[PDB]
């Protein structure tokens, strides 16, 4: 689990710092490769960031902003690839790392291994305690095809800086220590060489290496230019298919592999979609739809079959919240591609408020591919039961890039997400819900699908208070796990279910309309089965599955009346056909 996803929060204040630190830790601890963006913002003076130690690779941009920490241990960060860029220009942005309007603020970038930026520049502004930043030969770190990269570095301070250690080859370091010298890997090489470990031809890295190397060959790179194929840097992964040399039929390559980030993988990671093209993604490629085989992307046979979009997608890409202008856009939808967010502006902006009953559109919703975010929600509604049949929030898109379920500041008394069995990825953040019990009631363990996931939770109704009012799970709920009060909110029913009510026994032996049991569901015996005494009443739903007929039998069926096709009661009660026409 060298691999995590980053976040996509930019400069946004976390709704709660307490949880912000926990998320950061959960997200990054043990992580070596960040897919997406490494964003470290609003971190207090007292913050232990050792969980960051192991990061060697950042696919998107790195942003260290609005922090009071004196240091962030990214000493092992080797390459940032700049796949996405901050303010569309920057692969590394270090901003406003100094106290609110001893003392606080980041002192030294400490990026001693940072030896490759593939795309995008560097933005270092308003860092009052920060020294050294203007000492680095960015020219070296930027890739050969990235010199045109923007660099905008501010050296206004608030402490007087001493020069780099005399031990550092030119003026160049990441910090004060003889251990902090910039090692140069591009400007210092023999002939037309992209990367090296020293001034000699023999010091030259393979052409497939990205940040330096420890030897001359494609197995010795500090990072891959493109793809890491089983510890060997390669331009591209092996194709999922070989072609017949005469016919050109697809033949499976046993060596074939999918590209996941800058890696070659035998199988897409759990929550990603496999492509026909041999890649792993989170949205399908053009004229390609998803199917379940696990989840693949294929070519649409007939022209791509239309779909229902959530926020973050299509005409709703730059749309904030679900509002009275777009809510009916979800009428009838089983599956929303993208997200749903309810914010104050959703209810009480001159824009007409969502009335609670409009919300009912979501009754058919079973899957959100994106996230679910709730930061306002009708007082009159005690739960999320409009989402009762929501089975799976996949989190291929994450609120702030971090959370796939968010519930904050809501008024709700319980969750009622009684169908939800998966949080594909992302974290769950349930904070500041005054009256909300039945949170530590849900076996979060079971919804999560990777170890980077957890439930982050504060300022909801204190648990002893919930019990003090007598608000536990119902008896009939297996293992004390539920989404809210009463026999309809169990995670797994411990006995039998009639409809959606978890019940003690089905009416198999006793009780007004008799029943049989199919996989723990109580289903009605056909009304024409004679309820039996001391024995079962039927074997299934049909009128030929009775032990005995309540009235007559037109074999194989028990029936109310003989049909009048004109038939008449036998003496034994079975319908014979009338002999006259």
């Amino acid at each position: 689990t060298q691999v995590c996803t980053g976040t996509d929060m930019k400069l946004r204040l976390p709704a709660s710092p307490e949880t912000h630190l926990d998320m950061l830790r959960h997200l990054y601890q043990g992580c070596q490769v960040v897919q997406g963006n490494l964003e470290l913002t609003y971190l207090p003076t007292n913050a232990s960031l050792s969980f960051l130690q192991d990061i060697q690779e950042v696919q998107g941009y790195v942003l260290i902003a609005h922090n009071q920490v004196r240091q962030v241990p990214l000493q092992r960060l080797r390459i940032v690839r700049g796949t996405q860029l901050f303010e569309d220009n920057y692969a590394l942005a270090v901003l406003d790392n100094g106290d609110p309007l001893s003392p606080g603020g980041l002192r030294e970038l400490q990026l001693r291994s940072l030896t490759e930026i593939l795309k995008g520049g560097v933005l270092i502004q308003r860092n009052p305690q920060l020294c050294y930043q203007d000492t680095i030969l960015w020219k070296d770190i930027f890739h050969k095809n990235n010199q045109l990269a923007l660099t905008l570095i501010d050296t206004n301070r608030s402490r007087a800086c001493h020069p780099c250690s005399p031990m550092c080859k030119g003026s160049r370091c990441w910090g004060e220590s003889s251990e902090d010298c910039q090692s140069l890997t591009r400007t210092v090489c023999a002939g037309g060489c992209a990367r090296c470990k020293g001034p000699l031809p023999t010091d030259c890295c393979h052409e497939q290496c990205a940040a330096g190397c420890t030897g001359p060959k494609h197995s010795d790179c500090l990072a891959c230019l493109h793809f890491n194929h089983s510890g060997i840097c390669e331009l591209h992964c092996p194709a999922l298919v070989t072609y017949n040399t005469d016919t050109f039929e697809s033949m499976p390559n046993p060596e074939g592999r999918y590209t996941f980030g800058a890696s070659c993988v035998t199988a897409c990671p759990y929550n990603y979609l496999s492509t026909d093209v041999g890649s792993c993604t989170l949205v399908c490629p053009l004229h390609n739809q998803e199917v379940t085989a696990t989840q693949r992307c294929e070519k649409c046979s007939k022209p791509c079959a239309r779909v229902c979009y959530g926020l973050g997608m299509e005409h709703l890409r730059e749309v904030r919240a679900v509002t009275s202008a777009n809510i009916q856009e979800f009428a009838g939808c089983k599956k929303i591609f993208g997200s749903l967010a309810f914010l104050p502006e959703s209810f009480d902006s001159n824009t007409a408020p969502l009335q609670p009953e409009q919300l009912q559109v979501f009754e058919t919703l079973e899957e959100i591919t994106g996230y679910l975010y709730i930061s306002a929600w009708p007082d009159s509604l005690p739960d999320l039961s409009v989402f009762q049949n929501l089975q799976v929030i996949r989190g291929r898109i994450l609120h702030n890039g971090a959370y796939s379920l968010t519930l904050q500041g809501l008024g709700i008394s319980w969750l009622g997400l009684r169908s939800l069995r998966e949080l594909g990825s992302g974290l769950a953040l349930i904070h500041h819900n005054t009256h909300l019990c039945f949170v530590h009631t849900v076996p979060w363990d079971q919804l999560f699908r990777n170890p980077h996931q957890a439930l982050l939770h504060t300022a909801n109704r204190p648990e002893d208070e919930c019990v003090g009012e007598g608000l536990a799970c119902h008896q009939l709920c297996a293992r004390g796990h539920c989404w809210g009060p009463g026999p309809t909110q169990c995670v797994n029913c411990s006995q039998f279910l009639r409809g959606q009510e978890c019940v003690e026994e089905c009416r198999v032996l006793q009780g007004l309309p008799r029943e049989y049991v199919n996989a723990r569901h109580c289903l009605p015996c056909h009304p024409e089965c004679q309820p039996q005494n001391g024995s079962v009443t039927c074997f299934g739903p049909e009128a030929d599955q009775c032990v005995a007929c309540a009235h007559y039998k037109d074999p194989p069926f028990c029936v109310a009346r003989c049909p009048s096709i004109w038939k008449f009661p036998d003496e034994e009660g079975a319908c014979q056909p009338c002999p006259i026409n």
Epitope: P541, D544, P555, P556, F557, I565, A574, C575, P577
Partner: antibody, heavy 120, light 108 residues
């Protein structure tokens, strides 16, 4: 005339699947039970499955339960037998039949049959 | 699971003959018994239902009776077209079951 047409017959590899189809013509399948009945070469008639399309309630012979799946598509007026995990025992002519009528539980109409032949 | 024992498994009769085909039910089946005729490479066709009722457009030469659990198909004046396999079926319970069939051959 009422009419029931089987299709989908042909060679299956042992272990393989196959989907038989029965298009009804001249009555609605929702109004009755549809059975599939099969006949190995030179052997008797063997009831396989029945479906009641109004509610999709099914019943199955022991020799097929878990492999074969009966189903209906009311819009297409068509019944199906989804035959999974076939073996040489299963080589037979598959007919489709109804219990035409609501107090008439004899099989009044039958399709022409499709030969399924299970073989490597 | 109601079994239907059909005998004989095959018979030879000539044109004009009165042929009889029996079938015993393993348990009580009331009147829920049907008779089918299958001809070389054809679907079976229904002859008799509810034990003794001539189906629409079947020659009156075909007759069915019950005598307890024994059920009898009678072809009363065998004709050449009557060359076929004949099958009782019970539908008293589900599953419905077929007899083994009895082959009628014509002696000319």
């Amino acid at each position: 005339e009422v009419q029931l047409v089987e299709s989908g017959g042909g060679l299956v590899q042992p272990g393989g699947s196959l989907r038989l189809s029965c298009a009804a013509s001249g009555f609605n399948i929702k109004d009755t039970y549809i059975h599939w009945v099969r006949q190995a070469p030179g052997k008797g008639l063997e009831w396989v499955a029945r479906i009641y399309p109004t509610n999709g309630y099914t019943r199955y012979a022991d020799s097929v339960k878990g492999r074969f799946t009966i189903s209906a598509d009311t819009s297409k007026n068509t019944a199906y037998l989804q035959m999974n995990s076939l073996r040489a025992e299963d080589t037979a002519v598959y007919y489709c039949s109804r219990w035409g009528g609501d107090g008439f539980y004899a099989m009044d109409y039958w399709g022409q049959g499709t030969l399924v032949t299970v073989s490597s | 699971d109601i079994q239907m024992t059909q005998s004989p498994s095959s018979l030879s009769a000539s044109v004009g003959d009165r042929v009889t085909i029996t079938c015993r039910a393993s348990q009580d089946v009331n009147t829920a018994v049907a008779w089918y005729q299958q001809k070389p490479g054809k679907a079976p066709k229904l002859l008799i239902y509810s034990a003794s009722f001539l189906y629409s457009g079947v020659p009156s030469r075909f007759s069915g009776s019950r005598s307890g659990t024994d059920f009898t198909l009678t072809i009363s004046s065998l004709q050449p077209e009557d060359f076929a396999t004949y099958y009782c079926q019970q539908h008293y319970t589900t599953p419905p079951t077929f007899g083994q069939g009895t082959k009628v051959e014509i002696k000319r």
